[PDB]
Design an enzyme around this catalytic site. Structure first.
Site, PDB file in Angstrom:
ATOM      1  N   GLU A 232     -18.348 125.407  -1.453  1.00 48.87           N
ATOM      2  CA  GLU A 232     -17.315 124.331  -1.337  1.00 48.87           C
ATOM      3  C   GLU A 232     -16.559 124.152  -2.658  1.00 48.87           C
ATOM      4  OE1 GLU A 232     -18.846 120.959   0.999  1.00 48.87           O
ATOM      5  OE2 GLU A 232     -18.983 122.363   2.701  1.00 48.87           O
ATOM      6  N   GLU A 337     -22.203 127.677   6.836  1.00 48.28           N
ATOM      7  CA  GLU A 337     -22.848 126.357   6.798  1.00 48.28           C
ATOM      8  C   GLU A 337     -22.262 125.469   7.886  1.00 48.28           C
ATOM      9  OE1 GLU A 337     -23.020 124.351   2.893  1.00 48.28           O
ATOM     10  OE2 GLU A 337     -23.119 122.271   3.971  1.00 48.28           O
ATOM     11  N   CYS A 339     -23.583 121.544  10.186  1.00 50.49           N
ATOM     12  CA  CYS A 339     -24.612 120.507  10.466  1.00 50.49           C
ATOM     13  C   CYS A 339     -23.962 119.295  11.138  1.00 50.49           C
ATOM     14  CB  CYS A 339     -25.331 120.089   9.182  1.00 50.49           C
ATOM     15  SG  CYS A 339     -24.213 119.513   7.873  1.00 50.49           S
ATOM     16  N   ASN A 364     -16.469 129.788  17.497  1.00 55.00           N
ATOM     17  CA  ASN A 364     -16.458 130.724  16.348  1.00 55.00           C
ATOM     18  C   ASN A 364     -16.370 132.172  16.856  1.00 55.00           C
ATOM     19  OD1 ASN A 364     -17.029 129.649  13.282  1.00 55.00           O
ATOM     20  ND2 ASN A 364     -17.323 128.094  14.858  1.00 55.00           N
TER      21      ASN A 364
END
Ligand SMILES: *[C@@H]1O[C@H](CO)[C@@H](O[C@@H]2O[C@H](CO)[C@@H](O)[C@H](O)[C@H]2NC(C)=O)[C@H](O)[C@H]1NC(C)=O
Ligand SMILES: *[C@@H]1O[C@H](CO)[C@@H](O[C@@H]2O[C@H](CO)[C@@H](O)[C@H](O)[C@H]2NC(C)=O)[C@H](O)[C@H]1NC(C)=O
Ligand SMILES: *[C@@H]1O[C@H](CO)[C@@H](O)[C@H](O)[C@H]1NC(C)=O
Lengths: 491, 496
Positions: A232, A337, A339, A364
């Site tokens: 990030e 990543e 969540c 995706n």
């Protein structure tokens, strides 16, 4: 071999309870027949059934037609992150319960994970802020060392995961912060970027830090498939960013890869390790890919683009993942990543949170992504530990006082992909005969066989048929709030 | 004209302190002769709409960025600027002493303040309420014989609206939005959560809900208040989410389409309130253009829809071009309006007193809106307490005015002055016109023309570096100026 033992925590569905001596596992069809695995809100967990492939079909009911000749991306894999928090929670269980937890993820009797993301030192899912080089102004990195978090928690659990896995496993490494003495702000968190300019002592030291990390893991007989340029990078441009970060603009990332990280990695004994750029929200695409990859000094070092998403949100995929593929079709997209939770952090037995995982994996896969990586492998019922209390959900919740772990719906929604889509699987076309409330995706294994996953995010049962020209019609139902994986032979 | 009395609370800039006897205000603006401009400046360093004048000259001394007015390139006409008279805002304003109340209302609505000409009015309770009422809580009342306004309307909102209209020279447009129906019209029987109207468009549930809009317009009409427009439902997508924590009512785009065509449109048209406009969506812009395609491609719905209302909150999930731009292209005669133009990073408090960043976020979003066809803005709560309250669930947002009841004072935030750089200087009927940058630059800028043909240009500098700037009006000449780091400028001039 052993079925789910369900427990309710009063939410929409059930968790599967495992302990030192019991955990649910699988023990693993002929041409003309199909296999179907089902999980439901009502409590079924990867229940296996078989039906006949019928030569004919008639109806004004929903039909999905395989287009076996319309080939798209080949799949790298599925996995999650061995964070300090995940490794701590797993190793607090008794040894036999640890073995059953690792088997759930990494054995052929579990869900077949072949990806592990490894933080390079500390992140928010840590119990302290360290880096590998905290001695101030140590430009030669003579005090670079792995602490106990690597040598006693992460590395031993990674060795045990690779031993349980029959598939080869790919390790992905991502740093959150550099040493504070390499940063404009002198802190692991807050708004701050590398000091100086690409090519200079700070940038070359940071690039060598990657090689030292890879050297140290290799001394422990682990080798990496890929590293990310930074976790990030957009975060360390934000004032008051609360946990470990290192700010880069796309221009800085471009210049850092071109001048420092690419060459440093290329001249090292670890030159086969791939480099992924971005490692951040897909909303930064396609601008970030254009800045970096339209410069050949940087592009020759970049193997792929790593994307993140927070699954409570819904943003357009074609405009971001789609356009990026179109501009850079030879640069793989990889989801590093994802969540849910922050609404309560951990919602034991939440069916919605499972649907968020499988809906995101299908989105995706429909837009060129080759792999999908969960965040923490395991958390406690609080969603930690986390030094800034930035608590989230995890597919496996460890209850240390009971020597127990809970497999959440998220674990099973993940598994309906990871167990049945080996490395090399290729997505192929699948066309709906009419508008519908189903998400679906079809792939072919290396060997030739077919896999199709179908999620129903509505409460209504949907009758449907799947046509494959080479064998006939699969007649089936999608129960409301269900997920099914269909397998069948073709030759 | 009294200047800002500044106060720091440890954030990037200052608030302006007001009380029962003192509030910062303007004289009525005053246009100089042809060849002269007026500039109003606000800075992070502390300047608050400071006036200066200078020349527009025939010689171009500047060698930097040039912004050229193109008055023959004509875009949207502006409906105006305002905020929301929520229960929370009315309670906060009315806990001040009367003289302080009058200075807070003047700040927003007087020609000596920032010239607001829109107020959004919730139809009964929302999260910015201290309880969970509707106007028809008695069940099985399908003709709504027991519809009535509570204290929140008759004692707090309505008197404050009357006083705002009395302060404003500009005519003020009222906009109404419901959050929830009575719970006995809902599938879930609750004010919040996953819940839509019972049954199907055309039926007695949907007719009763449409009749509720008329009962509401009738009740405000009895208090001598008329509405410009209503929205079909506040954030209709919220009511499709399990556990949605506060008042909502779920519509799919298809249910909104059929509710408008069968019930709300025909019921409004057959009433004495048939002149009231109807805006659709009132929700996140990521839902466009799909929501507009579903509703507007049905002629039986589209005949009743005057405009599309959008909310700012989740703007970061979808860019302006793909959403506002595409929606305008597909439906160029349906106006776009920003009905909830509000803020907060998970690690910051609801209220940051003196945040320059939060002010820059407002002016940046208004400029992007204006460059993508938006005609109007309603801010959320007109005023909150220092906790961002009251709110019966959770304080996620800031407000341009913060009231300190315990000291009989209020604080005008940077947000207030960023809004005012637009609202004060862009009257209803103003038209956005071309403004061409000569080269790539870090500024945000927009040009409009007033009804009388005079020019207004707003320039925002979100960078730390001063930017030398020339503005060219082909009819007058060259304005040599500077956009200081962390500044916002409004420039005004006669063109003949
Ligand atoms: C671990 O979980 C297993 C399975 O739930 C437990 O085994 C059960 O023991 C209970 C005693 O209450 C019996 O009613 C069941 O017949 C057992 N089931 C099976 C499949 O063996 C075991 O007791 C748990 N261990 C601990 C230490 O609590
Ligand atoms: C409201 O605030 C104003 C200005 O902050 C107060 O006026 C000041 O009062 C002091 C006495 O404490 C004088 O020495 C200053 O000259 C005043 N400043 C100005 C600009 O007039 C005012 O008294 C406050 N009102 C109330 C009712 O407390
Ligand atoms: C750094 O390394 C030197 C020896 O090479 C050692 O004596 C010293 O303890 C180290 N510092 C830290 C904090 O480990």
């Amino acid at each position: 071999a052993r079925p789910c033992i369900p427990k309710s925590f009063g939410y929409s569905s059930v968790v599967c309870v495992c302990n030192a001596t019991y955990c649910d596992s699988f023990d693993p069809p002929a041409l003309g027949t199909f296999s179907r695995y089902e999980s439901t809100r009502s409590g079924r967990r990867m229940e296996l059934s078989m039906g006949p492939i019928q030569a004919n079909h008639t109806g004004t009911g929903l039909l999905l037609t395989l287009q076996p000749e319309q080939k798209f991306q080949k799949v790298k894999g599925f996995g999650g992150a061995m964070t300090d928090a995940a490794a701590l929670n797993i190793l607090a269980l008794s040894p036999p319960a640890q073995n059953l937890l690792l088997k759930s993820y990494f054995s052929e009797e579990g869900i077949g994970y072949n990806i592990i993301r490894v933080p390079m030192a500390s992140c928010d899912f840590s119990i302290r802020t360290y880096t590998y080089a905290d001695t101030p102004d140590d430009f030669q990195l003579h005090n670079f060392s792995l602490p106990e978090e690597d040598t006693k928690l992460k590395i031993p659990l990674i060795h045990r995961a690779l031993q349980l896995a029959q598939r080869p496993v790919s390790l992905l490494a991502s740093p959150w912060t550099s040493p504070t003495w390499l940063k404009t702000n002198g802190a692991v968190n807050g708004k701050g970027s590398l000091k100086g300019q690409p090519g200079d002592i700070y940038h070359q030291t940071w690039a060598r830090y990657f090689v030292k990390f890879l050297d140290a893991y290799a001394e422990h007989k682990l080798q990496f498939w890929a590293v990310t340029a930074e976790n990030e990078p957009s975060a360390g441009l934000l004032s008051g960013y609360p946990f470990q970060c290192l700010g880069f603009t796309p221009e800085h990332q471009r210049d850092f890869i071109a001048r420092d990280l690419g060459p440093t990695l290329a001249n090292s004994t670890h030159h086969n390790v791939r480099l992924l750029m971005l490692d951040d929200q897909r909303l930064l695409l396609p601008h970030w890919a254009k800045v970096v990859l339209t410069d050949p000094e940087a592009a020759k070092y970049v193997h792929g683009i790593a994307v993140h998403w927070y699954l409570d949100f819904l943003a357009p995929a074609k405009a971001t993942l789609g356009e990026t593929h179109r501009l850079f079709p030879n640069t793989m997209l990889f989801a590093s990543e994802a969540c849910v939770g922050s609404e309560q952090s951990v919602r034991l037995g939440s069916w919605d949170r499972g649907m968020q995982y499988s809906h995101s994996i299908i989105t995706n896969l429909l837009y060129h992504v080759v792999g999908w990586t969960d965040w923490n492998l395991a958390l406690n019922p609080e969603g930690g530990p986390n030094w800034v209390r930035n608590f989230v959900d995890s597919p496996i919740i460890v209850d240390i006082t009971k020597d127990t772990f809970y497999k959440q719906p998220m674990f099973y929604h993940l598994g309906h992909f990871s167990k049945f889509i080996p490395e090399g699987s290729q997505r192929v076309g699948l066309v709906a005969s009419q508008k519908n409330d189903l998400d679906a995706v079809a792939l072919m294994h290396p060997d030739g066989s077919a896999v199709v996953v179908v999620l129903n995010r509505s409460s209504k049962d949907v009758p449907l048929t799947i046509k494959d020209p080479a064998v006939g019609f699969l007649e089936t139902i999608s129960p409301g709030y269900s997920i099914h994986t269909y397998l069948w032979h073709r030759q």
